[PDB]
Design a protein around this ligand. Structure first.
Ligand SMILES: [Cl-]
Ligand SMILES: [Zn+2]
Length: 249
């Protein structure tokens, strides 16, 4: 589909209807609101179309600070109001709710089932413990969302006991869905908590996810990797990617 969209940018160089241009800008806004990134050849067409504006293919510093503008890429951290927005509408089972509310916030919410079943070679009671042990080395509060299945041999427990002594474990019924509990416990704990597993808010969810998801651990950046603009500038990631199209005018 990106292939088709690119072709309309190419047509844009000669089509100087400024009503046509604002439909091309709508595409850019669609990319932003849905965490999509153009291909490299699509990026070239965007740069080229805008220049009919100065474009440069660049990278982003550790506190980017784009190498091209010197401008600072949008922050990945949610504002207190933005976070209280996204939080409210995700919660929009009471044993779990109780479990959370009678306890201090957590730092990492771990989807035990999906984490354990991702490196299929090793036993999954072992894999969970390994993830927990590496994280408990820094004294974080850990909530492991598990199932009654984990406390039934054989998921050697044994090994689950070592898990429960370094992480807090809530064992939901085996039929329960994973996503609701993880989203609740993480968002309830606060903007600081991370996890392992409308248009403005769907964007917020995407910003929140990118800045709070621990990927097996991958580093979380200071800045937000999305198509973005300030009016005088556009910053478009392409080909999360690390290459950026820099536009300023
Ligand atoms: Cl697509
Ligand atoms: Zn730049």
């Amino acid at each position: 589909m990106l292939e088709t969209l690119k072709a309309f940018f190419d047509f844009g160089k000669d089509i100087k209807d400024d009503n046509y241009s604002n439909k091309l800008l709508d595409i850019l806004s669609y990319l932003r609101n849905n965490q999509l990134y153009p291909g490299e050849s699509f990026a070239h067409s965007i740069k080229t179309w805008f220049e009919s504006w100065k474009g440069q293919f660049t990278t982003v510093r550790k506190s980017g600070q784009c190498s091209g503008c010197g401008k600072t890429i949008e922050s990945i951290q949610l504002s207190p109001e933005e976070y209280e927005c996204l939080k409210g509408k995700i919660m929009r089972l009471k044993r779990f709710e109780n479990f959370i509310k009678s306890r201090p916030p957590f730092d990492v919410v771990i989807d035990g089932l999906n984490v354990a079943k991702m490196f299929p070679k090793v036993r999954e009671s072992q894999l969970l413990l390994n993830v927990v042990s590496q994280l408990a080395k820094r004294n974080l509060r850990l909530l492991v969302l598990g199932r009654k299945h984990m406390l039934r041999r054989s998921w050697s427990r044994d090994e689950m006991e070592e898990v429960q002594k370094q992480a807090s474990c809530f064992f939901a019924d085996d039929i329960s869905e994973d996503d609701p509990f993880l989203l609740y416990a993480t968002l309830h704990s606060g903007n600081h908590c991370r996890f392992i597993t409308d248009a403005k808010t769907q964007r917020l969810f995407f910003k929140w996810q990118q800045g709070h998801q621990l990927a097996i651990f991958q580093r979380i950046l200071s800045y937000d990797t999305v198509v973005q603009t300030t009016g005088d500038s556009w910053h478009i990631p392409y080909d999360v990617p690390t290459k950026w199209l820099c536009l300023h005018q």
